[PDB]
Structure 1
Amino acid sequence: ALFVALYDYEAITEDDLSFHKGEKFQILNSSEGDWWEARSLTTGETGYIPSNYVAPV
């Protein structure tokens, strides 16, 4: 179940994952709240994303 970024997000913190609309992710953790831990399929970079900014692929 991949996910796609519906908006752009620019992290300020280090653990957040910045991304652009259309980028696709694979979620690693989503039970720890509404900020999921995602891995960028494009770069292989992992970090937390605003779950409400992504939608299933």
Structure 2
Amino acid sequence: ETKFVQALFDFNPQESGELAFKRGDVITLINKDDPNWWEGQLNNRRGIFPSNYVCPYN
């Protein structure tokens, strides 16, 4: 099964390799082994983001 997470807030990246997103965007989960930094796919972009900035989606 493919997991999706909806962004609760905007995440403005401060380092390279971090997935930028806006509130309401839906990211496709790729990896979440790390309690704080998760990896996902938002459109043609892929990178890591703060786990606490999202929650599960449909």
Structure 2 equivalent of residue 18 of structure 1: 20
- Give the TM-score, by structure 1 length: 0.87
Q: Distance in 1 between matches of 2:44 and 2:51?
A: 18
How many residue pairs get matched?
55
User: Which runs of 5 or more residues in structure 2 are unaligned?
Assistant: none
In the TM superposition, residue 12 of structure 1 has moved relative to its aligned partner by 1.6
Percent of paired sites with the same residue = 31
The residue correspondences of 1:3-42 to structure 2 (distance < 5 A) are 3-40=5-42
- Give the TM-score, by structure 2 length: 0.85
In the TM superposition, residue 34 of structure 1 has moved relative to its aligned partner by 1.6
Displacement over 4 Å in runs of 4+:
none
Q: Distance in 2 between matches of 1:49 and 1:16?
A: 6
User: Which runs of 5 or more residues in structure 1 are unaligned?
Assistant: none
RMSD: 1.0
